[PDB]
Amino acid sequence: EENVQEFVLKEDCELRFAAGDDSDVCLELVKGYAEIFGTELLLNKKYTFPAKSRVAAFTWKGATIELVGTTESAYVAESTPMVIYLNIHAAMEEVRKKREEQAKAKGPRLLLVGPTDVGKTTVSRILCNYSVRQGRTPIFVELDVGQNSVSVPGTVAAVLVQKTADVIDGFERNQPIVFNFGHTSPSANLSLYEALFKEMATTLNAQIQENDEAKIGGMIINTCGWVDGEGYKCIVKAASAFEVDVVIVLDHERLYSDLSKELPEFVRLTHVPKSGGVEQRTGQIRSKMRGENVHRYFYGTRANNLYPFTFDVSFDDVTLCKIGETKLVIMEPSADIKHHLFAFSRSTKADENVLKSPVFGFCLVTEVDLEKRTMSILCPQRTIPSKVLVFSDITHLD
């Protein structure tokens, strides 16, 4: 945390680096202009990245960048797909302008698809940032229940993006619409997963009728990496449910070939390569990452800490329930709920409505005292926002 590496980037180059397993890396742009996944860097601002961060700082015009601290790897790459990503943004904006002159105008809807670790989340981040920098407010839709960049694992979620991502923390999640799926993969309950994203689409369609900026902002929709078997059919159903105009396939020629023959002819399908900077991650690291996501939901980040409450709740004061493949079941408080997330349902009653109701948020059950009929929960707020708690199979040791 003291030794220094200096890099000169020519136009259209990016510095790719990974922080050591053991320490922070601090990046500073010292000359020119640069961006990290679409967010512009401020000249001479010091950006501190935590252990194991994997980052690319790209420049359109040329830049000089300093890194302070131990890196596992740091090199300048001279060939990237960045112009491709920019041209996708450019095309979307063109569509917005055309529909604005025709008109309230509906923004383009883009579905990003492809297998795991082709940079789908990063590309969605770049596209959302570019939209924001264009003065638009797109809706980012997260359909990946495993690796979710909006809420905890086991959710389908959407958020109006009004500010570029923080280079370190990612997007500010200002009042997301969140549905509790309750599993880390769609395969655990396919019919529910489909019902949820269709409910999401319906909800969003009504929301944007009341908000013209969001309506023309359009949608950038991230799917999970499940592209084979039933995962393929989910992509097709998502494209239909969200009425997408554009499908971007990342690094999967077969999937691109299949969708070309299946999607309605009006849908523009674009195949794009993955960046050579994308890290291929193991199941083990993916699991640790879901864990860190849960931790972040309650405790926030090093930049912006959250201070969650720990208090006891009487089993007389709540109803516990679980979905599933369609039926709600009332759960009797038990030892087996310990370590599980529960969602605070927006439905006032534990009835048919829970299934299609969004949630206020989550709590984590840390202890269960069956004798006293109480549980200890970790919760974002001082009191529970709902008396209806919906089971999630996602567990976390805090």
Ligand X SMILES: Nc1ncnc2c1ncn2[C@@H]1O[C@H](COP(=O)(O)OP(=O)(O)NP(=O)(O)O)[C@@H](O)[C@H]1O
Q: How many CB atoms lie within 10 A of CB 248?
A: 25
**CB of 112: closest distance to ligand X in angstroms?**
9
The mark string for 132-151 relative to Mg ion (x by CB under 5 A, - otherwise) is ---------------x----
Which structure tokens are listed for 210?
A: 């009341």
Judge whether 15 and 76 are in contact, CB under 8 Å: yes
Q: Which residue has the tokens 């912006």?
A: 304
From ligand X, Mg ion, none, which one binds at residue 240 (CB under 5 to 8 Å depending on kind)?
A: none
Does residue 293 touch Mg ion according to CB under 5 A?
no
Which residue positions form the known binding site for ATP?
Answer: 14, 54, 117-122
From ligand X, Mg ion, none, which one binds at residue 116 (CB under 5 to 8 Å depending on kind)?
A: ligand X
The two beta strands, 35-36 and 177-180, are: unpaired
The mark string for 90-119 relative to ligand X (x by CB under 6 A, - otherwise) is --------------------------xxxx
Question: Could you give the count of Cα atoms lying within 13 Å of 85 in the half-sphere of its Cβ?
Answer: 27
The mark string for 106-125 relative to Mg ion (x by CB under 5 A, - otherwise) is --------------xx----
**CB of 322: closest distance to Mg ion in angstroms?**
27
Which structure tokens are listed for 292?
A: 């860190």
For 387, counting Cβ atoms within 10 Å of its Cβ (0-12 exposed, 13-18 middle, 19+ buried), the class is middle
The 3-state DSSP class for residue 258 equals helix
* 246-250: strand order across its sheet: 177-180, 155-160, 139-142, 219-222, 109-113, 246-250, 268-272
Does residue 54 touch ligand X according to CB under 6 A?
yes
Which structure tokens are listed for 47?
A: 């950006």
* Interface residue with ligand X, options 1, 279, 351, 352 (CB under 6 A): 279
For 196, counting Cβ atoms within 10 Å of its Cβ (0-12 exposed, 13-18 middle, 19+ buried), the class is buried
Q: For Mg ion, how many residues bind (rule: CB under 5 A)?
A: 3
Element (H, E) at 142: strand 139-142
For ligand X, the binding residues in 116-175 under the rule CB under 6 A are 116-122, 144, 147
Which structure tokens are listed for 355?
A: 């299934």
Q: For ligand X, how many residues bind (rule: CB under 6 A)?
A: 17
| Nearer residue to Mg ion within complex by CB, 53 or 59 | 53
Shortest-Cβ-distance residue relative to ligand X: 277
Does residue 350 touch ligand X according to CB under 6 A?
no
Does residue 225 touch ligand X according to CB under 6 A?
yes
Does residue 380 touch ligand X according to CB under 6 A?
no
* Interface residue with ligand X, options 13, 19, 27, 56 (CB under 6 A): 56
| Nearer residue to Mg ion within complex by CB, 135 or 283 | 283
Amino acid 275 reads: S
Contact residues: ligand X, CB under 6 A:
16, 54, 56, 116-122, 144, 147, 225, 275, 277-279
Q: Where do contacts with Mg ion occur on this chain (CB under 5 A)?
A: 120-121, 147
